[PDB]
Design a protein around this ligand. Structure first.
Ligand SMILES: *SC[C@H](NC(=O)CC[C@H](N)C(=O)O)C(=O)NCC(=O)O
Length: 106
């Protein structure tokens, strides 16, 4: 449990952009397409592809972020929110500077 939380923290530290996703979730597909359009290749973790570990990671995500929905987006190691939250930062002109500060590749 503490190791899993640590693993999540490491994951978001190791990758400029992390998207905790489900393959079937339209909002996740939508935020993935935004990143594609901004020439960013995020680390995508598909919770529905991880079997028993999926709900365990979600428990950690709710504790760390206050969010129970997917996609759960992190940039530069910081929680962003979901698809609508990410798109808000985009419209506000804040997302691209965050991506460059996070050293997002591509
Ligand atoms: S597609 C699966 C669901 N995702 C959302 O409803 C995300 C909505 C946010 N506004 C966003 O990311 O844009 C989901 O995670 N449902 C699970 C639940 O408990 O409702």
């Amino acid at each position: 449990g503490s190791r899993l939380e640590d693993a999540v923290k490491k994951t978001v530290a190791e990758n400029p952009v992390v998207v905790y996703s489900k393959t079937w979730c339209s909002y996740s597909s939508e935020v993935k397409s935004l990143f594609k359009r901004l020439n960013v290749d995020p680390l995508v973790v598909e919770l529905d592809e991880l079997g028993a570990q999926g709900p365990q990671i979600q428990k950690v995500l709710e504790r760390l972020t206050g969010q129970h929905t997917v996609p759960n987006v992190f940039i530069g190691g910081k929680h962003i929110g979901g698809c609508t939250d990410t798109v808000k930062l985009y419209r506000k002109g804040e997302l691209e500077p965050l991506l460059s500060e996070a050293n997002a590749k591509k």
